[PDB]
Amino acid sequence: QVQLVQSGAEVKKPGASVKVSCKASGYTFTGYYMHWVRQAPGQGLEWMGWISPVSGGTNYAQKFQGRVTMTRDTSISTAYMELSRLRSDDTAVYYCARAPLFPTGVLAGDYYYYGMDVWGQGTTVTVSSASTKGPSVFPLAPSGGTAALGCLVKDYFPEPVTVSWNSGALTSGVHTFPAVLQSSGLYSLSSVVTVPSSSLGTQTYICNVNHKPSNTKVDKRVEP
Amino acid sequence: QSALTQPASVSGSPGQSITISCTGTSSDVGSYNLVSWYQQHPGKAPKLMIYEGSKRPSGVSNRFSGSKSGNTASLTISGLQAEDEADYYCCSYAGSSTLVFGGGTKLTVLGQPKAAPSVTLFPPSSEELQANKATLVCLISDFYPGAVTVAWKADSSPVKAGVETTTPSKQSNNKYAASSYLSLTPEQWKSHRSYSCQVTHEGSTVEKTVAPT
């Protein structure tokens, strides 16, 4: 069961620092470089640096100099990456990945030299000046034989928000859209249901919006 | 050193071969036999496909091969299948105890049918209006390929201010979805006879209109 398991999503203000961790399971931790690679939303992969677990030596791309601190704890097979003086363009998914320290050895092995063959699942880091805020929830009322109704989840921070309908009972025809990020720094999303127009006068539709970071949980009835 | 250069996109048909190029400099791709290639599917971590220029990890389809000429490495995929659609990254030891990625290449496998978007436009709710705010919501779904432009109009007048539009995102049925929001004062909303969301996809436009009433 060879795997890298990374710590959970982070939300930080400009100027703060973030510490991402990465725990290895199922292999010899001290036999592989741990590489760190990040990926901004929609963008390409960007190599950040590596650490040797035997010595603790590290190198990193010149643009992260004096900002990135990679460490490890061999007794718990855990690598750490700390990025300081954060800025909004540090918003990205951060990955760790292993590659072998040696191209061969007396142990037979894969020796995928300079190939990053096992990757953590990624850690989302969001850098933003915005402050936590729960959403306003508004119904989008229904006006050929089918109708569309929905909920607008307006002006919240941070991600994520979860939406269901009728406490889970209704999934057919549901489309929850990815959030837009507004110039204000706040997010908005919509969820829409396509429904037989006959049911409109008889059955009830309620969207369940849950925004854990603000303790906001709202069940909005959507009527004609 | 600097990023490796890959084409932004390549495409081929099912059953064909395609080749993706990766140009570096003499001090990385040209000096070492250490190029690796990664396939990344949406929302997944990259997967190693080729290492040391041309070797495949165990379990990786023999349809994938690597090669090099001067400072340019190549990934060739034979017998293209629909699941090969993804972003591909090359990566090289760069010297100076440093690695560097290429910018990545989006590989699209043709034959997936075109589909115009469905557009639903909602006016501001009476609830929102009674809190002195107003948002129009234009929802756009089921289109392929996945690029649309959204323009808004007040009556017949273009509207640039207060528009926020998402990038398109693949939905589970492999078509795409996007949304656009127009923020307005309630005053602005109650004063024009109508507002319109116009979605353009592949040179054709679908338009929805709402009206205070």
List, in sequence order, the alpha helices (H) in B7-149: 126-129
Please tell me the total count of domains within chain B.
2
State the best of A114, A149, A184, A220 to mutate against chain B, taking most chain B CBs within 10 Å. A114
- Contact at CB, A115 and B128, closer than 8 angstroms: no
Buried b / exposed e over B42-72, threshold 16 CB at 10 Å, is: eeebbbbbbbbbbebbeebeeebbbebeebb
Q: Which residue of B46, B51, B103 is in closest CB contact with A114?
A: B51
Q: Tell me, yes or no, whether B173 lies in a domain.
A: yes
Q: What are the tokens at B204?
A: 């054709």
- The CATH number for A164's domain is 2.60.40.10
Select from A114, A122, A5 the least CA-distant residue to B37: A114
Same domain, A116 and A146: no
Same domain, B138 and B83: no
- Contact at CB, B45 and A122, closer than 8 angstroms: yes
- The CATH number for B15's domain is 2.60.40.10
Of A76, A98, A127, the domain-final residue: A127
**End-to-end Cα spacing for chain B:** 62
Same domain, B140 and B202: yes
State the best of B99, B150, B170 to mutate against chain A, taking most chain A CBs within 10 Å. B99
Q: What are the tokens at B98?
A: 């440093």
Same domain, B88 and B151: no
Strand locations in chain B (E):
9-12, 18-23, 36-40, 47-50, 64-69, 72-77, 86-93, 99-101, 105-109, 118-122, 134-143, 149-154, 157-159, 163-165, 169-170, 176-184, 195-201, 204-210
- In degrees, rounded to 5, the angle at the alpha carbon of residue B77 between the alpha carbons of residues B74 and B82 is 140
* Residue range of the domain that includes B55: 9-109
Q: Tell me, yes or no, whether B2 lies in a domain.
A: no
Q: Which residue of A139, A190, A192 is in closest CB contact with B127?
A: A139
Please tell me the total count of domains within chain A.
2
Q: Tell me the CB-side half-sphere exposure of residue B208, using CA atoms within 13 A.
A: 17
Lookup result for tokens 């165990």: B58
Q: What phi, psi does A78 have (nearest 5°)?
A: -125, 130
Contacts of A147 by beta carbon, 8 Å cutoff, 6+ apart:
A194, A195, A196, A197, A200
Are the beta carbons of B68 and B53 closer than 8 angstroms?
A: yes
Phi-psi region of A215 (alpha: psi -120 to 50; beta: other; left: phi over 0): left
CA distance to B49, B51, B63, B66, B103, per residue, from B9 (Å): 18, 22, 19, 18, 11
CA distance to A81, B110, B127, per residue, from A78 (Å): 10, 43, 51
Same domain, A14 and A116: yes
Q: What are the tokens at A92?
A: 């990205």
Q: Tell me, yes or no, whether B1 lies in a domain.
A: no
Bridge partners for A220 per DSSP? A207
Q: What are the tokens at B112?
A: 């997936």
CB atoms within 10 A of CB B159: 18
CA distance to A38, A46, A59, B5, per residue, from B102 (Å): 13, 9, 19, 5
Q: Which residue of B40, B120, B171 is in closest CB contact with A148?
A: B120
Same domain, B159 and B188: yes
* Residue range of the domain that includes A82: 3-127
Residues of chain A found within 8 Å of residue B91, distances taken between Cβ atoms: 45, 47, 114, 116
Same domain, B123 and B162: yes
Are the beta carbons of A68 and A49 closer than 8 angstroms?
A: yes
Resolved by: X-ray
